[PDB]
């Protein structure tokens, strides 16, 4: 009953099971630990970062090793459009003979790989199960390096100080230039040297790379300035990927669009992209001042940025010390940027597939988009939660105020009511009218008169599609016109490739849109606005409100303030995160439902099914869920089973976890404490069991813990059931 | 970089004078015990108790390897594979083309014998109050003192004799595995070569 929460003496003195539960959930909140200083905080965070990167590299190495050992990578190379990639083998003693037979792939039961790693590794120039093994070996070596570094930087003479940790200019210069630019430069080097010849049949391994010229002229044009030579003779339109037939000699080109065979971006396009990004980031990494008297001091930049007329208060004067001294502000900024970035990855890796033969891998396309959108929602909610935490525990009004006037951040708490009221107005506006149009379509179609539907053509979005060259909406605007200056400017660089790809019905590049797209985009906007409303309200109201003008004194996460003053359930800022998690899950569900139904109709060919039935709710319920759930639920029946049996089991498992979350959310404490007391009496008053007694007094889960557990069940069930549905439906419908 | 100190003066390494002399074995033992208590206090890790137990097991296993070689040579060690219909799909190793290669029955029998011996060990582990030599160290008990580079030359059924023979057997197993890995033959093939041919005859 002691010594487990070593970091908290208050918990270690708890005589109940709450100590164990809270010991888990407070282990990473280093700022709240006993005998805590800032130096130890930054050093522990640094070591934890090292361990985390080691974990990531070990996970990647495991994926590589299991593809190399139990996969069919080599067979998939020779026939990427017919051979289904294998993730890893299965050894489960609970299998019957039927399950073994159904999951049997080649030599052993195995799982199909939906991560798209086969296409990614094939694109970057891997052709052998020994290339994957080398990658796994190297990644385990890197993990060992990172673990050694993490141990080393906790040693006495190697523990960095607060000044080093808060040295913003040095870290920015190095991160930008070194990390981004130099990693892009090295990736361009690999892309060219290995990937470009490997796509043309020439093997460039760790033996013949110092003697195989990536370009026939060989670094002469680069130093000579004749950089056009690297773009001459690109890959033809009859080039077979991985073979020298119809190949070229160029290494950096503009082509635009996709490879005619793999239906993916040109490797020479991506090498040029990464070279340009490398140059730009290396240049941008010299901005801030270091030991050589030139550069920028960001404190001065922030302080000097006050509009002269005066509408942002005193400007950004106090922001430097605010961000530097708070790890939650930086964490929130990083999480918001990462969420936007992974939303970008999801939205671009389906419209512009970058890996060979990934466009025809429909289950992996759906899985990748869903995975990245869910990660995006999680990251955004985390960014807002950490902003709220910064408000609660790191924000100092004195730093952000100069002689009564407030800086740009402190002024966000002055018109907080205006911000929240207008977020509420936008949410109500969008919800009222999107639901009104959807229900109008529902009722009108149900009454057998679909012509009375309200169908709004998304002209604004179709205008953008025409601006990028789509000649489908008869707009003749910028790139849909051959005479506009936008078209004449790039008529010789990348329009022929771009136009040939955007004006193609088999791509996902700028999918044609209609009224259903309009309505679902408005639903998405409503979801985004409502999630933002909840999170922003929790962040701004974190330090106090009218119901609790001292909420900052109770911390970020506390159960309530009691039944007084009318009742104060879910009044903390943590509860705002807890409520906004449901809205994030709902919004990501809407986004992924829209994407998956649109792409299922596109792949099956019945795009008229979406364009007609997507305007009313029953259309969704009947033609997406009810229609495509048939292959999934018949993964096992009283007659047999298929390789989709695991997905049906996961479907039911997700439903069960969802409803257990419903348990933990609807039923609150107090009802579970008295029942536990009855159980305690029963155990204490029964023979043959009195010999065994608990060391920690069994008590009901706390209010905040119960909310967390219900949210965890809700989210896990949500994710599992939707993953099972999307994967099984795609597999069982599209062969 | 220049206007500040990367490492504070208050956080600097101090040379541990407590390990002066203290040959690498003593230094390693002290470092392990200080760094990992509650597993060192149990006798686990680089400890004389663990060394003695592992030596006993290595000697018994040299005996077991000789017995296994004899059984393989003398027509024992049942033939074929396990019945998947009888023992489920967990005994299936691979399916090449329409035939299920299962775990060899000889491997199953050897695993059952090893299970017998390991069960005996587990009973002795959860029988601490009735066994002559316990597996772990009692709280308070102190680990027997390391024997050193060369244990005392005391012939017979002595602690030093068992200690020396356990070290020799463990080194022999290490050498056997190293020879098998370097040259590439089976473990029993290496033992057969190292016995002239008198085992697999």
């Amino acid at each position: 009953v002691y010594k487990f929460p070593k970091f908290s003496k208050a918990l270690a003195e708890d005589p109940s099971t709450r100590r164990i539960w809270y010991g888990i959930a407070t282990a990473h909140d280093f700022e709240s630990h006993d005998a805590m200083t800032e130096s130890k905080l930054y050093q522990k965070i640094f070591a934890s970062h090292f361990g985390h990167i080691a974990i990531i590299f070990l996970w990647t190495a495991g994926n590589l090793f299991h593809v190399a050992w139990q996969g069919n990578f080599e067979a998939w190379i020779l026939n990427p459009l017919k051979v289904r990639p294998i993730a890893h083998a299965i050894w489960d003693p609970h299998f019957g003979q039927a399950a073994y037979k159904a999951f049997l792939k080649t030599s052993s039961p195995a799982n199909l790989a939906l991560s798209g790693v086969y296409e990614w590794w094939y694109t970057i120039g891997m052709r052998t199960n020994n290339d994957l093994y080398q990658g796994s070996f190297f990644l385990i070596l890197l993990s060992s390096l990172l673990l050694f570094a993490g141990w080393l930087h906790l040693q006495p003479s190697f523990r960095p100080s607060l000044d080093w940790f808060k040295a913003n200019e040095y870290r920015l210069n190095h991160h930008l230039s070194g990390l981004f630019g130099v990693s892009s430069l090295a990736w361009t080097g690999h892309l060219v040297h290995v990937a470009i010849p490997e796509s043309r049949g020439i093997h460039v391994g760790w033996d013949n790379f110092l003697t195989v010229l990536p370009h026939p002229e060989g670094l002469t044009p680069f130093f000579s300035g004749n950089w056009k030579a690297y773009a001459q003779n690109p890959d033809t339109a009859s080039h077979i990927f991985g073979s020298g037939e119809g190949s070229g000699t160029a290494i950096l080109t503009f082509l635009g669009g996709f490879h005619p065979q793999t239906k993916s971006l040109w490797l020479t396009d991506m090498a040029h992209h990464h070279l340009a990004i490398a140059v730009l980031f290396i240049v941008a990494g010299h901005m801030y001042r270091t030991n050589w008297l030139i550069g920028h001091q960001m404190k001065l930049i922030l302080e000097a940025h006050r509009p002269p007329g005066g509408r942002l208060g005193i400007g950004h004067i106090g922001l430097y010390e605010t961000i530097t001294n708070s790890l939650h502000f930086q964490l929130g900024l990083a999480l918001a940027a990462l969420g936007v970035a992974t939303s970008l990855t999801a939205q671009h890796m389906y419209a512009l597939p970058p890996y060979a033969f990934l466009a025809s891998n429909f289950p992996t396309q759906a899985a990748l988009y869903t995975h990245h959108q869910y990660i995006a929602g999680f990251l955004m909610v985390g960014a807002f939660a950490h902003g709220a935490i910064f408000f609660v525990r790191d924000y100092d009004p004195a730093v952000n105020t100069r002689n009564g006037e407030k800086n740009v951040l402190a002024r966000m708490l002055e018109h907080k009511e205006a911000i929240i009221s207008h977020l509420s107005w936008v949410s109500l506006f969008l919800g009222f009218h999107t639901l009104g149009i959807y229900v109008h379509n529902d009722v009108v179609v149900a009454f057998g008169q679909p012509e009375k539907q309200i169908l709004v053509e998304p002209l604004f979005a179709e205008w953008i599609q025409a601006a990028s060259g789509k000649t489908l909406y008869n707009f003749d605007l910028l790139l849909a016109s051959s005479n506009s200056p936008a078209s004449v400017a790039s008529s010789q660089l990348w329009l022929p490739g771009w136009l040939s790809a955007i004006n193609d019905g088999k791509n996902s590049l700028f999918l044609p849109i209609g009224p259903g797209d309009f309505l679902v985009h408005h639903a998405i906007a409503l979801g985004l606005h409502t999630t933002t409303l909840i999170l922003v309200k929790g962040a701004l109201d974190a330090r106090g409100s009218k119901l609790m003008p001292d909420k900052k004194d109770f911390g970020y996460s506390f159960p309530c303030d009691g039944p007084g003053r009318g009742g104060t359930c879910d009044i903390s800022a943590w509860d705002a995160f807890y409520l906004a998690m449901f809205w994030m899950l709902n919004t990501i569900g809407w986004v992924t439902f829209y994407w998956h139904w649109k792409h299922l109709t596109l792949w099956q060919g019945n795009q008229v099914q979406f364009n007609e039935s997507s305007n009313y709710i029953m259309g969704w319920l009947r033609d997406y869920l009810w229609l495509n759930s048939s292959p999934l639920i018949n993964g096992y029946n009283p007659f047999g089973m298929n390789s989709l049996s695991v997905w049906a089991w996961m479907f039911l498992f997700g439903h069960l976890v969802w409803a257990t979350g419903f348990m933990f959310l609807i039923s609150w404490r107090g009802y579970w404490q008295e029942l536990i007391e009855t159980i305690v009496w029963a155990h204490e008053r029964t023979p043959l069991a009195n010999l065994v007694r608990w060391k920690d007094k069994p008590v009901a889960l706390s209010i905040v813990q119960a909310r967390l557990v219900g949210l965890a069940h809700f989210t896990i069930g949500y994710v599992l059931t939707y993953a099972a549905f999307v994967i099984a439906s795609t597999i069982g419908k599209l062969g | 970089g220049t206007p500040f100190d990367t490492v504070s003066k208050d956080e600097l390494a101090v040379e541990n004078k407590a390990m002066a002399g203290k040959s690498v074995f003593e230094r390693a033992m002290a470092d392990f015990n200080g760094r990992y208590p509650a597993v060192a206090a149990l006798g686990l890790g680089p400890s004389a108790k663990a060394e003695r137990w592992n030596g006993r097991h290595a000697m018994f296993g040299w005996i077991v390897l000789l017995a296994t070689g004899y059984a393989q040579a003398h027509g024992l060690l049942p033939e074929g594979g396990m019945d998947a219909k009888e023992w489920g799909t967990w005994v299936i190793v691979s399916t090449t083309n329409g035939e299920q290669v299962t775990i060899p029955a000889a491997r199953a029998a050897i695993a059952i014998g090893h299970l017998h011996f390991g069960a005996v060990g587990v009973f002795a582990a959860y029988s601490k109050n009735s066994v002559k030599d316990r597996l772990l160290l009692e709280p308070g008990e102190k680990d027997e003192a390391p024997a050193g580079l060369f244990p005392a030359l005391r012939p017979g059924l002595t602690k030093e004799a068992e200690m020396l023979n356990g070290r020799v057997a463990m080194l022999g197993l290490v050498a056997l595995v190293a020879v098998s890995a370097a040259t590439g033959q089976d473990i029993l093939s290496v033992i057969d070569q190292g016995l002239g041919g008198l085992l697999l005859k």
């Binding site: 090292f50 361990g51 | 760094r35």
Partner: peptide
């Protein structure tokens, strides 16, 4: 198909990465 030697040494290297992980884990304290 990878050999027994390839998998074995990868397992051995994985063990070394495990001992480095507990050293980091124990250094981040109990």
């Amino acid at each position: 198909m990878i050999y027994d030697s390839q998998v074995y040494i990868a397992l051995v290297i994985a063990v070394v990465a495990s001992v480095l992980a507990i050293r980091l884990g124990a250094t981040l304290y109990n």
